[PDB]
Design a binder for these strands. Structure first.
Lengths: 76, 49, 155, 105, 43
RNA sequence: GGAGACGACGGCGGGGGCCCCGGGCAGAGUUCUCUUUUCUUCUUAACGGUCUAUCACCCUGGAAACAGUUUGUCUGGAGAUAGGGUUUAAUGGCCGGAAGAGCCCGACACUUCUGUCGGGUCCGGUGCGCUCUCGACGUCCCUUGAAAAUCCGCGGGAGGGAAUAAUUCUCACGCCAGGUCGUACUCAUAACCGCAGCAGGUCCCCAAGGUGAACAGCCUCUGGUUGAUAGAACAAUGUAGAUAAGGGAAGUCGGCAAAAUAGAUCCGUAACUUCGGGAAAAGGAUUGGCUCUAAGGGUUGGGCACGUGCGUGCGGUUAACAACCAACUUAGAACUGGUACGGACAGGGGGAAUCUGACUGUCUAAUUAAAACAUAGCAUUGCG
RNA sequence: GAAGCCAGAGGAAACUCUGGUGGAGGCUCGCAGCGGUUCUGACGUGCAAAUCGAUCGUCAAAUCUGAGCAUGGGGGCGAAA
């Protein structure tokens, strides 16, 4: 797993061809939001403060990329 | 001359403060990119084109 | 009715020893019908199988004995069983004393109370077992300062 | 000055006239100790009844709800209700007294 | 109590019988019919 | 050329885990009385990023009034101290993984099928502790404590290389592939060997709390057992464990056996001697509980003038002061119970001599462990 | 408690004395392990074709031990019985 600290790098990673899926994790106790994109080798995580602009980053993400919110319980 | 324990502790605090300042500066840079996200996406698409 | 399998499965499911598994004695037929871990989990959720809590091992007496020994009880000659060195090594005492004295001498030299020549002389006296503790070293330093000041006033 | 509020809700056994709220308030007044001394509430701890089988505790020291639950279980043991009533933390600082699960035989 | 060899089963893990609860409240002098323990008992 | 690739032992320092202490939420137990109580959960992998971590190395400069420095006396004009840097080394901090997991608690639902939803999972401290690991030292040797597969660096400069652009880049990302065999269970007072489900034998890893010097003995937690034909009675003689008035070896081939001694602190300790020993020689004084006192530690922190938190130029060694934090030993004193105070457990009887083998060591598995054998030392013989 | 080391007191020095430090030894008490001294011991068609109990020797090394491998009866191996 790798942490991406730059929005431009994260957008390029999400525009890569092997980007199979992406998910959004919300941690309200720490007031943070994580964008995780699954590629062939690595899972890339961008960590942001929970904010409206962080919500609008989803619209700048590519539309063909499937994006899902993480539920509160990981059911098997 | 030989420095004292207080001077060594002051140097250590100064280095810790520099590391902290770098961390907040990097976080602020990431935030500014987050508000400038749409223009960044436009530039990435233009470069790909 | 034999419940050895159910007790083994309940121990594995609850993550405890088999001696901590309680099977309901009034539901022996219903428990005997459970042949799978899923049925065992269902019985645990229904409360027919529970995990018993641990047996008490309190530390209260150990803590009170530690407090009494801290304030000085139970330390007499009738209580000691090892030799004085076995209880408290002289090598450990010497190591602590030498580290204390060298730390104090380094602090004094760094702050500028003593000069480097006096530091070296006191270091070798401390290695040669002149000073019993930090207080004795401090009085020796004060007397050396007084003698040096008297010599400077005379000259 | 930090102020903590605690609720002991005994409304259901109080309505069933099993639990005596005034006796419980007297018991808390005589048993809560401050600085290791009973009868030393002073201006630090206030105990009152806010009605409907509820006891309200204001603390300005570091009084703990676990200590309040300990004293509540002591009162239940004195009143022969320990085997039949349970003190359950329902919210932050709220402890409710309720019956254990009953089976119809 | 047998706390030297084993711990006491917690009271919340055992369902108390309604007859025993009614009997104990009766000796404590509580009118149980006015409060209706029969509806409160599970089955 | 390096790695692979290397002994044993000793103390010291760092890190993980375990043990221990305090606070907090939740749950459980105790509650005649007492107990803000006792106990339980409170966790974070590989793989990565980032900031740091002893040795060592580099730069300035040139040390006697020698200095630095370890528990351990080594280092320095072959360049020390000091000041500033560079690097080997993480099981260290933070972040990604990762809370979505696991764990704990609660409220509903539930013929079964099945569950559903809430609340948390936090903050510190300590060490001659135990265990593993790493590092720097040191000691010993007429003993100096593997090899190969395999991987990497360098020396060399053969080839191969550009503006029709080239690239034969140990960088990032992307694409493709990974066969065969073993894998249950026991590892022993019933899964092995001893004719057996035989009190024998059979190689390792992990190893909690109390007492205590201590993986001694005794008691306890986790986890296991409660299996070894049973019931009744209590004669002799047994086997095993004990006590016995007075005497105290009168017993017996023979003090055989038992008893006595035993831990720790202190006083004291002869002959002989290869000077190392003898020695814990011998012979004495003491030891519980309670309430106190004293001693032995760590961290942080100095005034001006300017420039502007650092730089200077100064000025001062009573910080010999304050604030905060912390653990175990040692000594001294009063009081107090007593038939006992290393109260169980654990745990030398001592001495005077003689013979004998120098010592440590070894053998007759299943009757002999010894003056036997070996040993170092000494002497002789053969061999260029 | 051996070398080595530090300090103090002497001694012209070599050295001497005192207090520490240090941690050597086919040294020593002793747990496990290894071994096998003693007992009118237990057992004696035994739990056992050599076992059991107490006691005892040794316990940092000429210590204990696994696997792989070598030596084969006119032999081997033998701290030699």
């Amino acid at each position: 797993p790798q942490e991406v600290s730059d929005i431009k790098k994260f957008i390029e990673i999400c525009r890569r061809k092997d980007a199979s899926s992406a998910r959004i994790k919300k941690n309200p106790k720490t007031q943070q939001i994580k964008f995780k994109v699954r590629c062939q080798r690595f899972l890339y995580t961008l960590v942001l403060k929970d904010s409206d602009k962080a919500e609008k980053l989803k619209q700048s993400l590519p539309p063909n990329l499937q994006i899902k919110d993480v539920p509160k319980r990981n059911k098997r | 001359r030989r420095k004292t324990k207080a001077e060594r502790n002051r140097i250590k605090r100064r280095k810790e403060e520099e590391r902290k300042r770098k961390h907040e500066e990097a976080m602020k840079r990431k935030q500014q990119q987050l508000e400038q996200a749409k223009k960044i996406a436009a530039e990435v698409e233009e470069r790909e084109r | 009715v034999n419940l050895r399998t159910q007790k083994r499965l309940a121990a594995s499911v609850l993550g405890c020893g088999e001696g901590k598994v309680w099977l309901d004695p009034n539901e022996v037929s219903e428990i005997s019908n459970a042949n799978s871990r899923q049925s065992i989990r269902k019985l645990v959720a229904d409360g027919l199988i529970i995990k018993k809590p641990v047996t008490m091992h309190s530390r209260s007496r150990a803590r009170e004995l530690n407090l009494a020994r801290r304030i000085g009880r139970h330390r007499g000659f009738g209580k000691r069983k090892g030799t004085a060195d076995a209880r408290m090594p002289q090598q450990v005492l010497w190591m602590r004393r030498q580290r204390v004295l060298r730390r104090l001498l380094v602090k004094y030299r760094a702050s500028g109370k003593i000069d480097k020549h006096l530091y070296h002389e006191l270091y070798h006296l401390a290695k040669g077992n002149t000073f019993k503790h930090k207080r004795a070293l401090v009085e020796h330093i004060h007397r050396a300062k007084a003698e040096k000041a008297r010599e400077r006033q005379i000259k | 000055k930090v102020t903590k509020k605690f609720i002991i809700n005994a409304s259901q056994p109080a309505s069933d006239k099993i639990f005596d709220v005034s006796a419980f308030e007297k018991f808390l007044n005589e048993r809560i100790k401050v600085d290791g001394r009973v009868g030393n509430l002073g201006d630090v701890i206030k105990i009152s009844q806010i009605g409907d089988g509820k006891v309200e505790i204001i603390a300005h020291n570091d009084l703990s709800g676990r200590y309040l639950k300990y004293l509540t279980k002591k009162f239940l043991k004195k009143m022969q209700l320990r085997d039949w009533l349970r003190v359950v933390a329902t919210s932050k600082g709220v402890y409710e007294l309720k019956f254990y699960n009953i089976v119809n035989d | 109590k047998s706390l030297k060899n084993r711990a006491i089963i917690p009271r919340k893990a055992v369902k108390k019988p309604l007859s025993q609860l009614e009997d104990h409240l009766d000796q404590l002098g509580v009118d149980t019919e006015a409060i209706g323990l029969r509806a409160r008992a599970q089955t």
